[PDB]
Short mmCIF file of N, CA and C in Angstrom, two decimals:
data_model
loop_
_atom_site.label_atom_id
_atom_site.label_comp_id
_atom_site.label_asym_id
_atom_site.label_seq_id
_atom_site.Cartn_x
_atom_site.Cartn_y
_atom_site.Cartn_z
N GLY A 2 63.04 84.67 43.56
CA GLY A 2 64.05 84.64 42.47
C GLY A 2 63.78 85.77 41.47
N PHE A 3 64.68 85.98 40.54
CA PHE A 3 64.51 87.06 39.51
C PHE A 3 64.31 88.43 40.20
N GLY A 4 64.90 88.61 41.36
CA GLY A 4 64.75 89.90 42.09
C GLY A 4 63.31 90.07 42.59
N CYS A 5 62.79 89.09 43.29
CA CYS A 5 61.39 89.19 43.81
C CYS A 5 61.43 89.40 45.33
N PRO A 6 60.37 89.96 45.87
CA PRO A 6 59.17 90.38 45.10
C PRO A 6 59.36 91.77 44.44
N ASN A 7 60.59 92.21 44.25
CA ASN A 7 60.83 93.55 43.62
C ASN A 7 60.15 93.62 42.24
N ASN A 8 59.42 94.68 41.99
CA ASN A 8 58.72 94.83 40.67
C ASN A 8 59.72 95.26 39.59
N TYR A 9 60.66 96.12 39.93
CA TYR A 9 61.66 96.59 38.94
C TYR A 9 62.54 95.41 38.49
N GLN A 10 63.12 94.69 39.42
CA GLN A 10 63.99 93.53 39.06
C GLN A 10 63.16 92.46 38.34
N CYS A 11 61.96 92.21 38.80
CA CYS A 11 61.09 91.19 38.13
C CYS A 11 60.74 91.67 36.72
N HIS A 12 60.44 92.94 36.58
CA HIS A 12 60.09 93.50 35.24
C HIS A 12 61.33 93.44 34.34
N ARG A 13 62.50 93.69 34.89
CA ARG A 13 63.75 93.64 34.07
C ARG A 13 63.96 92.23 33.52
N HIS A 14 63.67 91.22 34.31
CA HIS A 14 63.83 89.81 33.83
C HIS A 14 62.85 89.54 32.69
N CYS A 15 61.62 90.00 32.83
CA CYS A 15 60.61 89.78 31.75
C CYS A 15 61.03 90.53 30.48
N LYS A 16 61.67 91.67 30.63
CA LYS A 16 62.13 92.46 29.45
C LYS A 16 63.21 91.69 28.68
N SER A 17 64.15 91.09 29.37
CA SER A 17 65.23 90.32 28.67
C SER A 17 64.63 89.09 27.98
N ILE A 18 63.54 88.56 28.50
CA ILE A 18 62.90 87.36 27.86
C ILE A 18 62.25 87.80 26.53
N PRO A 19 62.49 87.02 25.50
CA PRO A 19 61.95 87.30 24.15
C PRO A 19 60.45 86.94 24.07
N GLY A 20 59.67 87.80 23.45
CA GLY A 20 58.21 87.54 23.33
C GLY A 20 57.49 87.97 24.61
N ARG A 21 57.92 89.04 25.22
CA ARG A 21 57.27 89.52 26.48
C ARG A 21 57.29 91.06 26.52
N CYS A 22 56.64 91.62 27.51
CA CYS A 22 56.60 93.11 27.65
C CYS A 22 56.81 93.48 29.12
N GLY A 23 56.01 92.94 30.00
CA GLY A 23 56.15 93.24 31.46
C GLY A 23 55.89 91.98 32.29
N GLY A 24 56.02 92.07 33.59
CA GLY A 24 55.77 90.88 34.45
C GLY A 24 55.60 91.30 35.92
N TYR A 25 55.44 90.34 36.80
CA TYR A 25 55.27 90.65 38.25
C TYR A 25 55.72 89.45 39.10
N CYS A 26 55.97 89.66 40.37
CA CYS A 26 56.40 88.54 41.26
C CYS A 26 55.17 87.83 41.82
N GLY A 27 54.93 86.61 41.40
CA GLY A 27 53.75 85.85 41.90
C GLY A 27 53.78 84.42 41.35
N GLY A 28 53.25 83.48 42.09
CA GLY A 28 53.24 82.06 41.63
C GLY A 28 53.77 81.17 42.75
N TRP A 29 54.99 81.42 43.18
CA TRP A 29 55.60 80.60 44.27
C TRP A 29 56.04 81.53 45.41
N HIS A 30 55.18 81.71 46.40
CA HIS A 30 55.51 82.59 47.56
C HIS A 30 55.85 84.01 47.08
N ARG A 31 55.22 84.45 46.00
CA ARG A 31 55.49 85.82 45.46
C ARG A 31 56.99 85.96 45.12
N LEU A 32 57.64 84.86 44.80
CA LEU A 32 59.10 84.91 44.46
C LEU A 32 59.32 84.56 42.98
N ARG A 33 58.33 83.97 42.33
CA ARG A 33 58.49 83.60 40.89
C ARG A 33 58.11 84.80 40.02
N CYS A 34 58.83 85.03 38.94
CA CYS A 34 58.51 86.18 38.05
C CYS A 34 57.57 85.73 36.93
N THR A 35 56.35 86.18 36.96
CA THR A 35 55.36 85.79 35.90
C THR A 35 55.29 86.91 34.85
N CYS A 36 55.76 86.63 33.66
CA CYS A 36 55.74 87.66 32.57
C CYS A 36 54.65 87.31 31.55
N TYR A 37 54.08 88.30 30.90
CA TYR A 37 53.01 88.03 29.89
C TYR A 37 53.50 88.42 28.49
N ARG A 38 52.98 87.76 27.47
CA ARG A 38 53.39 88.07 26.07
C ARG A 38 52.88 89.46 25.67
N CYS A 39 53.67 90.19 24.93
CA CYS A 39 53.25 91.56 24.49
C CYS A 39 52.35 91.45 23.25
N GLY A 40 51.22 92.12 23.28
CA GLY A 40 50.28 92.07 22.11
C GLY A 40 50.60 93.21 21.15
#
């Protein structure tokens, strides 16, 4: 989902999410987009 395991599509989803900076496809069969909070 969220354009996985594509890094560009997964990163685009993390960018639209508020309180984040980047992300990656991993968690559920490399299909979930895991984004981290920007420091």
